[PDB]
């Protein structure tokens, strides 16, 4: 993680870096992500959890994500943490049902 | 129309005016985040009056609400709604004191 942070700060062509930490449930992922973020010093850090998109409606969620991403494009350096990605896109394995608009937006973003 | 009278006095007297108060209740019912409607008209009309091209420093506006994380993000910038405070439920000493004052 430290290596990636260092590259993202001082480079010329790498202007967008993603990652994906996956593992068995209960393995303690979100803590590790936050720890990797907290030892960077970036001016702008923000987090999106299901706890804040609680009890809203779908359109509200899309609007909220839009606003967050918009705010991410007005400062030199930034970091951004996203949790679960199968809970924002409400996933129930029988049928199987889920919501498509949110997924498509996240894939484009 | 809520700012007319105070404004008149500021123009007349100057810096020797008398304080005015405006109490707002349920601030979370109309002033919601502007996205990308009537709501936007309301938000803009309030924004341009709280602090606009014309200086006005003989006023004090208090606001009361039950959900503090839904007001637009531009109404909470140093200069418009500066100090934010929380009211808890009374503790035991609070109840004793309340009893003292009421009885
Ligand atoms: N490297 C670590 N060392 C010690 N404790 C850790 C470590 N990583 C996580 N934890 C502990 O894990 C707990 C929180 O778990 P956390 O929410 O990160 O799990 P999770 O993988 O996100 O869970 P879930 O899949 O159920 O959403 C805390 O008590 C934290 O101290």
Per-position DSSP letters for chain A, written without gaps between them: -HHHHHHHHS-SS----------STTS-HHHHHHHHHHTS--SEEEEE-TTTS-S--HHHHHHHHHHHHHHTTSSSSEEEEE--SSTTTT-BTTTTB--HHHHHHHHH-
**Hey, how many other C-beta atoms are within 10 angstroms of the C-beta on A61?**
19
Mutation site for B-interface testing, chosen from A56, A58, A61, A67 by largest number of B Cβ within 10 Å: A67
Q: Is A74 annotated to bind ligand?
A: no
How far apart are alpha carbons B22 and A99 in whole angstroms?
A: 45
Q: How far is B66 from chain A (nearest CA, A)?
A: 16
How far apart are alpha carbons A43 and A106 in whole angstroms?
A: 24
Residues having CB within 6 Å of any atom of ligand 1: A 25-32
Q: Are A64 and A56 in contact (CB under 8 A)?
A: yes
Cα dist from A84 to A11, A18, A104, B10, B41, whole Å: 29, 15, 16, 56, 37
Contacts of B80 (CB under 8 A, 6+ apart): B50, B51
PDB resolution in Å: 4.1
With beta carbons under 8 A apart, name residues in chain B contacting A68.
none
Per the DSSP assignment, residues forming a β-bridge with A97 are A92
Q: Tell me the angle at which helices A100-108 and A58-71 cross, rounded to the nearest 10 degrees.
A: 10
Query: Helix, strand, or coil here: B31?
Result: coil
| Structure solved via | cryo-EM
With beta carbons under 8 A apart, name residues in chain B contacting A66.
35-36
Q: Is A13 annotated to bind ligand?
A: no
């Amino acid at each position: 993680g430290a290596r990636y942070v260092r590259q993202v700060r001082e480079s010329d062509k790498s202007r967008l870096v993603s990652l994906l930490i996956h593992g068995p449930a209960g393995s303690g992922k979100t803590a590790l992500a936050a720890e990797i973020a907290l030892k960077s010093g970036f001016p702008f850090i923000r987090l999106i959890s299901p706890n804040e998109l609680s009890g809203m409606s779908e359109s509200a969620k899309i609007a909220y994500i839009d606003n967050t991403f918009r705010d991410a494009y007005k400062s030199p350096l930034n970091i951004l943490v996203i949790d679960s990605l199968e809970t924002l896109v409400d996933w129930v394995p029988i049928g199987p049902r889920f919501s498509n608009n949110i997924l498509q937006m996240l894939k484009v973003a | 129309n809520l700012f007319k009278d105070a404004e008149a006095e500021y123009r007349a007297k100057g810096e020797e005016s008398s304080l005015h108060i405006i109490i707002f209740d349920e601030l979370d019912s109309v002033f919601k985040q502007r996205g990308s409607g009537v709501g936007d008209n309301v938000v803009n009309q309030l924004l341009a009056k709280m602090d606009g091209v014309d200086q006005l420093n003989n006023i004090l506006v208090i606001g009361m609400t039950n959900r503090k994380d839904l007001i637009d993000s531009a109404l909470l910038r140093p200069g418009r709604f500066e100090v934010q405070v929380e009211i808890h439920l009374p503790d035991e000493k609070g109840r004793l004191q309340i009893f003292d004052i009421q009885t």
